[PDB]
């Protein structure tokens, strides 16, 4: 919708309800992903490359604490290549990484705020 309406505050309030905390949810950004190659923060490198055993950020954030709320702040700024991964996060509820382990988002909450419109009905 518009700016300043409090979308992120609604998400933090929702996380405040069913956790009695406010920082246990998983916020990431979509403003740091303006180029093509930074997709691999949330996957991990294939076998043979520099950071391999460390794993993915978004993947490791769910193998522990598998009940989080996941945010995507201002998902417009990412040029249309990050969208190919959350095309398959949704509707299957799985994602894989370098090790071939399969995380499962089958009881998480996906909340992805946007910024478009802003003046129309």
């Amino acid at each position: 919708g518009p700016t300043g309406v409090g979308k992120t505050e609604l998400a933090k309030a929702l996380a405040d309800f069913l956790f009695d905390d406010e920082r246990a949810m998983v916020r990431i950004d979509m403003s740091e992903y303006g180029e093509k190659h930074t997709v691999a923060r949330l996957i991990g490198a294939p076998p043979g490359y520099v950071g391999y055993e460390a794993g993915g950020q978004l993947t490791e954030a769910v193998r522990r604490r598998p009940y989080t709320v996941v945010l995507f702040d201002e998902i417009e700024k990412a040029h249309p290549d990050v969208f190919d991964v959350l095309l398959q996060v949704l509707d299957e509820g799985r994602l894989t990484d370098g090790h071939g382990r399969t995380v499962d988002f089958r009881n998480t909450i996906l909340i992805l705020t946007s910024n478009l419109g802003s003046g129309g009905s």
Binding site: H37, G48, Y49, V50, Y52
Partner: peptide
């Protein structure tokens, strides 16, 4: 009037290996 009969022994210590971890250079 017994003897000594100096017995033998066997030794072992293995080796390591390294991995190179190429960098994609962009």
């Amino acid at each position: 009037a017994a003897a000594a009969a100096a017995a033998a022994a066997a030794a072992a210590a293995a080796a390591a290996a390294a991995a190179a971890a190429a960098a994609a250079a962009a």
